[PDB]
Amino acid sequence: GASMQSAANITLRQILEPNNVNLRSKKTHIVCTLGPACKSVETLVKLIDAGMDICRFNFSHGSHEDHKEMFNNVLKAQELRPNCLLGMLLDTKGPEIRTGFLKNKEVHLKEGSKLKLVTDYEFLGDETCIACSYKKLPQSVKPGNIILIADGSVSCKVLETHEDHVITEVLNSAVIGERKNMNLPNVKVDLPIISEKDKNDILNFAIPMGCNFIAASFIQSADDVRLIRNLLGPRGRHIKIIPKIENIEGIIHFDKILAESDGIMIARGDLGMEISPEKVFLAQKLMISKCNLQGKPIITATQMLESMTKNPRPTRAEVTDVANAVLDGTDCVMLSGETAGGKFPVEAVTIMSKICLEAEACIDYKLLYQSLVNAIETPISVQEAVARSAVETAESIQASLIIALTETGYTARLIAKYKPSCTILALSASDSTVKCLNVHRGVTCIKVGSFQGTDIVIRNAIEIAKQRNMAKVGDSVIAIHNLMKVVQIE
Amino acid sequence: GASMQSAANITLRQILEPNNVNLRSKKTHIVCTLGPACKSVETLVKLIDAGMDICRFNFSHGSHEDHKEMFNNVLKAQELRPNCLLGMLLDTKGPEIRTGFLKNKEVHLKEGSKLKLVTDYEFLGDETCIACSYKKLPQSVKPGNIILIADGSVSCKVLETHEDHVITEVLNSAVIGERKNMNLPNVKVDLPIISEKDKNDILNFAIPMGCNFIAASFIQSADDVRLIRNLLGPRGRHIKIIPKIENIEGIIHFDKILAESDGIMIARGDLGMEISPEKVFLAQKLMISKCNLQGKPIITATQMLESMTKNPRPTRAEVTDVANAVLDGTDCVMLSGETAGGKFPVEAVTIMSKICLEAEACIDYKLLYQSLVNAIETPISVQEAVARSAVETAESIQASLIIALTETGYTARLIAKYKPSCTILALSASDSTVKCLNVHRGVTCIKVGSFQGTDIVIRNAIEIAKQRNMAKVGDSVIAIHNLMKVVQIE
Amino acid sequence: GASMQSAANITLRQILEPNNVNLRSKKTHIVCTLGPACKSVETLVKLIDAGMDICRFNFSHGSHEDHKEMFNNVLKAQELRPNCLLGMLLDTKGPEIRTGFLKNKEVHLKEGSKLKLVTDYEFLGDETCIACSYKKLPQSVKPGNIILIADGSVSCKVLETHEDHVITEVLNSAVIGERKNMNLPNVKVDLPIISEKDKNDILNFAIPMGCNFIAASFIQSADDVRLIRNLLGPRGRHIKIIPKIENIEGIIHFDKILAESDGIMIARGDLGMEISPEKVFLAQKLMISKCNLQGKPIITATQMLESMTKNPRPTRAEVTDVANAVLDGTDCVMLSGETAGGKFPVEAVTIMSKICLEAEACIDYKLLYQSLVNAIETPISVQEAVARSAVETAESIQASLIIALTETGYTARLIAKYKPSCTILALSASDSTVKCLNVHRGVTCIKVGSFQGTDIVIRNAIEIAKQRNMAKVGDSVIAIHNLMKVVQIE
Amino acid sequence: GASMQSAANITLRQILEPNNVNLRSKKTHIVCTLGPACKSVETLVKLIDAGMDICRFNFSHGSHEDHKEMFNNVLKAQELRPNCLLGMLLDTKGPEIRTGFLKNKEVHLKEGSKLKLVTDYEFLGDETCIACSYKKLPQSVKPGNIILIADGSVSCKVLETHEDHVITEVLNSAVIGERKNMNLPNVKVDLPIISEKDKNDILNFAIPMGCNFIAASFIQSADDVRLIRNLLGPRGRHIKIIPKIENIEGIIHFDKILAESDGIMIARGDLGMEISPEKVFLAQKLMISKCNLQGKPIITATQMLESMTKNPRPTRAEVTDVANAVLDGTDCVMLSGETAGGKFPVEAVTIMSKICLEAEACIDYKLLYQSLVNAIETPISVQEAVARSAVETAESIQASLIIALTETGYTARLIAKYKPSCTILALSASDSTVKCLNVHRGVTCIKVGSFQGTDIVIRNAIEIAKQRNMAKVGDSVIAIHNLMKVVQIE
Ligand SMILES: Nc1ncnc2c1ncn2[C@@H]1O[C@H](COP(=O)(O)OP(=O)(O)OP(=O)(O)O)[C@@H](O)[C@H]1O
Ligand SMILES: Nc1ncnc2c1ncn2[C@@H]1O[C@H](COP(=O)(O)OP(=O)(O)OP(=O)(O)O)[C@@H](O)[C@H]1O
Ligand SMILES: O=C([O-])C(=O)[O-]
Ligand SMILES: O=C([O-])C(=O)[O-]
Ligand SMILES: O=C([O-])C(=O)[O-]
Ligand SMILES: O=C([O-])C(=O)[O-]
Ligand SMILES: [K+]
Ligand SMILES: [Mg+2]
């Protein structure tokens, strides 16, 4: 249980006058799933200009080599955009059930047609016959059952179950590519949380490549989170674990999963295949509420701008979904197929930033802070109080920035919890910190020198803030490191 | 200048437990647009069972012939569903700009290909050449301009402009049928709000057929409402006027439009094409808030479950759009192409009812009553105070129903304003009242045969309520008629 | 414990413009202790005119015959004021320690002088030697102890202890009469809750004379209240038990005492002698809150306008004490020595009415209603719901009266709990009801005939209301009997 | 116009358990009027221990030499108590009307006795004839007029008026001394705001002796305040002007008077004689509410514990008066005759401190700060923001103190406005600041060295706070000087 959503203030002015502010000045961060549509350095720079903050590498697709290439192109895109430090997110395979490979890379499934599902996962399929990664499929499904494919974009009714295959009837026309996700109704999937393939993805890519986050697919318990932490060991001590909530067990054990985790991802695609589509908005709102209360970052994911895979504009529902995720209190929003395989990756990232800018602009921050402080039980730590004091002071004097000097990012995470109206400028001499803080709403990072003076580091930040149009002369800034001070910009 | 959104109480119970209640028990009413996909009595009966409350007739499509056949098949579906009293809504053409007629009724437009937009509206087009209703189109657009087609699901870049035609580039692949809506960028449309074609539809369909509402397209002022009211005359005195807000002028003059109107339609499709898409959510939240304060009913429309024109289940953004429209304070939600030309009309309506039930079970109704009461100024009339108290009493004792005895529907309209947790049972002898109240959230009507004893009317209504499983023996009911009484079911 | 005090609104015009209103129009009711100072029918009539609602007969003073003569003078006063129905309250002796009788009816005790305390209670004393009613006095005190007399107005330090007597030092100058109350420090009084004399006062005066309330001195448990209820028996079934909280045991067991009681008296005199004076204001604010939350009436008693026993004007502290008792939420305020023995009984009652009216005019009834409704947990009974709804409907339409037709008084008590801005006119055929309801803030009673109908009764009530200037033509009145109706005075 | 009162939290524990805490640890400060009852150094030392914070010298009484010997005795007492820095308050005569001098210095006026009131102020009166300071007296009052004496403790009905005297009837029995204040009914007193006697008192006592405050009698306008400021000149620039509101003119112009002043004194004695006594509680609450809003200090004065001039313990009304002034939001409470001429001055100050501590113990500081912040419009100055944050932080971490380094007292006043739960420890090099901040609730000063750094002054303060047990090992303290730092006591 929980109670929700931030108070809005909408004027005619907001609806009619254009919001010409920079797309990178927004508070909500964007997770972009990388793939063929945005592989080039040139597209990665365009995505940075449009508002990309975190890069998602889905290990359910591609290969280590193709992911290694995309990763290095991101590093080259960062050399072209020095004021942008991107977080690197590895999204695991986990205990997934997938469709197979295809002869012509795309099949055009038609409503009313029969589709045979085979267990030979090496088989290159076509619209008449496709493979399933799950060898127990014939024994697991029964005639009448609805197999869901690609976030439920395809529904198949089981007609007959055999020894090695299943005959289905396609219930709707859809075009799908390779290795689409699947859901088998009321089937207890006999698959480990961490497979040998997951182990090779984490140890042989995540740790050597320098990923900041592990988005663990299908987490069911706090024990699963500890298992990954242990797998990561001493070398991966700075890699954050973001469990993905996408099954009933993740919902039931949410509170404990959240306690062990470094943040959460609401994996609505697979979740909306497991539970009734109408139940997902409840699960979304509940999980955001809880995360906001614990000060843990949350990523709202999947089918946010779905139509944008084919159209340069989103539907009406898609706009409200992004806006309402922001007003619910999400730290991040996410783009999946819209960036990885769609026709308009840049225009998808662009309008998402515009929707975030609009939604953030009508939030009632004075009220938002009051509602947080009322929910959080006091006494609180000295660090939390000073962090909170910074947010209230910033709001009272209409300060442009909160500058936090932090090695671990702890101070910045504490300020972020109180959702200030202004940007948080986290200043750190750690490379993991400056990229890990990207998952927290409204936190912008500057990488500083390891043993540099408090006041010189603050002036260099003010100088970069002036250089980035974040603050002008005459403005006030809050500086925090246990103390808080108000500096007038000059 | 508004402030909004109701408080949600979400438990694990709500997420995980199946809701097995009747689809017609929901408070949010559904407007279905009728068309070829639901032309049969069998299908029209399935939509009634699924939760349809108001039938929409888009006079921009079909013919007077096709619409008469449709109207009469609804009357036939009602004979089979006597506990359901549907409202009939005529949606005007208005000062619209449309794509013309097609050779094979449907075309597959492809990304990067050229499209010739001609001004001869008799030209049966193909994927290379399509007619445009606004003869002034070549002199109205300029090279580089983005023409929007079918709620902006098709974007066209003007390459060159000629005397009688325009040459564009199809910026995305899309399949479109006949008479798709068009938006011309920054063009002041020289067309009347009420045309001769519109007058013929109102005077020779709406009045003879007995339409309960006029959804007036592209309303820009209160004088346009006054105009339709005077047009309707005495013969159409019980017909409600529902201005559609779908342009900048409709937004600017919203307050004056609202004051003259009988309710509002948020026509997001054409509005989303007129203003930047990211600004539609702002418009929607502001208008719902303003209507909620005035006690005027509001219909949230377009692209609510768009993906369901092809798939038997919606996207994650579609589910939240509906849920959020309900939590915003909308009275009705609408289906356009999802029921008119879609492949899954019955499943579209069904999931829409399920999302409404799920969102309504969230609302903290005691907090919602308090916020309405705080935002309204005391003193109010004796009539409003008694309606207000019926809602408060109903909530305090957890009453099953609020039974309103009303000729006009005014009492039911007042109770509905205070949004109670239980159903408002509106008892009227008037056929127009009974069918008009369908636009107010949570109002269910019984048509009474006479105006006998005040206690016989109430007793017979409880007997009907019990049979319909709305009320059970031992429940309390509130009866309002100026007084309020609490009655025990026996 | 609890949390408290109602919202005040002070304008300059309230401070400067005179309050010309009738003194009996106030909501807060006055309890006047009757004695030699107000024995005459002539004075009792002026006391009615100055705002007296309940008469207190202190059985610690006088005699049965003297109390009977006064009671019959109250009945003659009421014949001259037929619009005034006084409640009769018997205050029991209880387990009290009293000073004796005096040779000259008064003693002028001088600071520094020695005072001998004797145990022969038949001895008429003087300035040098006064009797004490507690035989165990010399064995109950030790040298250095401070004996408090007359609400702590006299302090005596024990110098020496002997078999049959005690020698003390008068610590302050004071003039005192006979049978003043006493407090012995750290003494658990070896006296019963109800003595044979208390039994005789109850059964031989309260039941035969027809008293409406028993204010029981020194109640320590719910067992004491049940003892009294059983002592009253069938003949005393309509007599209300108002326990007096005047010792630690009464505070410790307050919640259980309150549950059995029909109301509470904050007997601040003795309580102020038993506990530290600074602690009494805490006890008072807590008790009023607990009573207000239960809908049980409370009387704030003792030393409210003390200085007015000698002066025609009160002190600044005395005015704030009365005003603050009203804002705290007391139902009644009491005058003890101010009316029973003082030099200005009429001017004491006059100013008390005037402070009450001034403070009642500060109250924000909308905020007061909201607070109570928030504090009381739902579901509430249908009866309590319609009572609550009559309060809200009256405030919403600015109604002049709440007309409640009740036999037992139950309905009027339910309305009185939600503290309306307007008077509650209770109509009852029961003579006990009509006199008992006086202890409730804002309730005015009219005795109706047993065989009169609802319409006849509501019409005569409205007629009396016009005659009494309680309501005028054009005003709205709420009538409740389970239903609520709004009536226009014509 | 205003709305008010601080929310209480009372438990049985606070009522039954003894609070044996140091009387100088309270937040509310005490203003003591010095007179013959407390002339000795030994008594002044006991008054300091009992909780005296400001010394009032009423120049309406005694001689210039009497006040000087008194001031010197205060200076001597302060040498025995060095951890206590008292404020010196001069109370002017103003445009006052007084009773004359007596040949027995104290007379006993009896009820129903005739009294002559002469205009020759050189006459030594008895109970049959007393002098008046207003020569215009028999040309200002008519038969039936009630002349008031000594805060209205004596009422005098005019029997007849002549040329040099009047004949009145003593309406009550009272013993009075020399120079008692007087109020003439509906008479416009033709006297100056500051007389030549007031001029000599301000210029030849307040400036040379070093008074910190001037409580100016009967201030009517902002022009009167500006006049005193002009008189005080640059020599007395550090002297605070505390206007006394004791007339209709002072209430009508309170806002402009408050704007010009350094604080306010609610002079209830004369005020209660000018307006109806039942209206004084309205004035008190409105004025406190307003002063609290502007963060200006307010003193609640007269008859707070009046009965204590004769008794070692107070009335019930007196306890609620002090307690309720604290809960209303008063900075100081004052003692007049209780300390200047009474029989029990030490016990009066003791009980006053005990009531303060009790009232302060039930204040909800988190709710108080919330209400203050909501009542003050944003943006505010950086100085007010930081000060506000010191309060919020202190409450969040349960800090022991707020240490404010301030030269003028500006910082400490800004903190005092937000009423923290912990003591404000103001540190200043200035002697006037240290003795002026006493008028602000919860402020304690330590006088520091002028040429010492911030960090040496803070660690010295901590060691003094430790010695006084105002802070201890393990505590958090907030240090403010524009910044806020949280210091751990080690
Ligand atoms: N009566 C009808 N007959 C045939 N097709 C219809 C009918 N009504 C709607 N449609 C089809 O469904 C689609 C969506 O319906 P809808 O009523 O929303 O029309 P529209 O083109 O979007 O215009 P508008 O902006 O007025 O709603 C139409 O474009 C059309 O293809
Ligand atoms: N009926 C009476 N006859 C004579 N004197 C009375 C009477 N009632 C009260 N008094 C006088 O008024 C004073 C105050 O009255 P009060 O009723 O408060 O009694 P009390 O002595 O204070 O005892 P308690 O604690 O019951 O109030 C008494 O002490 C007595 O002097
Ligand atoms: O993995 C995801 O993001 C999902 O399933 O939605
Ligand atoms: O007309 C409509 O309904 C629209 O444009 O959304
Ligand atoms: O009996 C009383 O009223 C008292 O003691 O205060
Ligand atoms: O002067 C005063 O203090 C008064 O009148 O109260
Ligand atoms: K004076
Ligand atoms: Mg005075």
Side-chain angles (χ1 to χ4, degrees), chain D residues 96-114:
Chain D
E96 56 170 17
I97 299 160
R98 302 259 156 180
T99 64
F101 287 85
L102 311 157
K103 46 191 167 282
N104 319 301
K105 313 229 193 283
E106 185 207 81
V107 293
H108 311 253
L109 306 163
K110 322 285 182 188
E111 191 183 320
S113 315
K114 285 205 185 178

Side-chain angles (χ1 to χ4, degrees), chain A residues 416-438:
Chain A
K417 178 180 185 171
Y418 287 88
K419 321 266 239 140
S421 45
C422 65
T423 297
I424 302 149
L425 210 66
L427 263 46
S428 179
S430 177
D431 300 278
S432 39
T433 301
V434 118
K435 286 170 173 174
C436 285
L437 282 171
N438 270 298

Side-chain angles (χ1 to χ4, degrees), chain A residues 196-480:
Chain A
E196 289 308 306
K197 285 175 186 189
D198 299 319
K199 275 167 186 167
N200 151 251
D201 291 349
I202 289 151
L203 304 166
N204 300 139
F205 187 104
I207 291 172
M209 291 303 285
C211 293
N212 308 111
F213 318 94
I214 300 317
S217 294
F218 302 98
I219 292 290
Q220 300 190 124
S221 62
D223 281 308
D224 290 343
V225 187
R226 291 187 211 101
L227 192 156
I228 298 146
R229 178 92 276 147
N230 279 312
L231 178 75
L232 282 169
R235 297 175 316 144
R237 87 242 243 244
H238 298 296
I239 310 172
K240 308 288 169 250
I241 302 162
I242 306 304
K244 287 163 70 185
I245 313 300
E246 43 187 355
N247 52 37
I248 298 162
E249 287 290 286
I251 288 151
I252 296 156
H253 307 292
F254 187 71
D255 287 357
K256 289 173 105 188
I257 284 158
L258 175 61
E260 274 298 330
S261 84
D262 290 299
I264 295 294
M265 189 195 282
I266 311 161
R268 303 180 312 175
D270 272 292
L271 190 63
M273 281 187 287
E274 182 92 313
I275 74 182
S276 291
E278 71 268 23
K279 304 291 205 195
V280 182
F281 89 85
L282 293 176
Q284 174 179 317
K285 275 147 140 67
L286 186 61
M287 296 186 268
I288 295 175
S289 190
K290 293 193 165 298
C291 281
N292 284 174
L293 217 134
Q294 291 317 129
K296 292 258 171 85
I298 185 153
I299 314 158
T300 290
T302 312
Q303 291 190 328
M304 295 210 84
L305 295 174
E306 202 47 41
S307 80
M308 294 214 60
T309 51
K310 275 85 101 100
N311 308 337
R313 294 176 99 245
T315 66
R316 307 304 174 275
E318 284 169 355
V319 163
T320 80
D321 183 62
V322 183
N324 282 302
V326 169
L327 305 164
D328 292 344
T330 202
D331 293 76
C332 305
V333 281
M334 186 172 107
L335 286 172
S336 277
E338 307 96 311
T339 49
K343 292 268 150 185
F344 303 95
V346 183
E347 20 292 94
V349 188
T350 299
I351 195 155
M352 201 167 238
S353 302
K354 284 161 166 196
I355 306 155
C356 294
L357 284 165
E358 295 312 336
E360 293 153 26
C362 61
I363 277 158
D364 194 318
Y365 288 101
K366 241 76 150 75
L367 287 181
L368 185 60
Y369 175 82
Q370 268 156 44
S371 58
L372 292 164
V373 162
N374 294 343
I376 297 132
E377 249 277 80
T378 82
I380 58 169
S381 73
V382 167
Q383 283 215 59
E384 196 161 353
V386 173
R388 191 158 132 148
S389 167
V391 176
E392 220 221 279
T393 311
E395 287 162 10
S396 303
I397 62 152
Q398 298 158 171
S400 298
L401 297 158
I402 303 153
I403 293 156
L405 278 74
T406 184
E407 176 60 31
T408 66
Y410 180 57
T411 307
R413 296 193 289 260
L414 289 171
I415 305 152
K417 178 180 185 171
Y418 287 88
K419 321 266 239 140
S421 45
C422 65
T423 297
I424 302 149
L425 210 66
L427 263 46
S428 179
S430 177
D431 300 278
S432 39
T433 301
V434 118
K435 286 170 173 174
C436 285
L437 282 171
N438 270 298
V439 77
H440 289 269
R441 186 218 177 250
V443 170
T444 299
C445 302
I446 295 163
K447 166 95 198 278
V448 302
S450 259
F451 200 54
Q452 287 192 318
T454 293
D455 283 288
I456 63 172
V457 134
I458 286 158
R459 239 324 169 280
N460 296 337
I462 279 155
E463 223 60 26
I464 298 160
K466 263 126 79 177
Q467 275 152 29
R468 285 195 213 175
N469 242 294
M470 293 172 121
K472 54 172 218 286
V473 306
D475 291 351
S476 305
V477 295
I478 308 295
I480 175 191

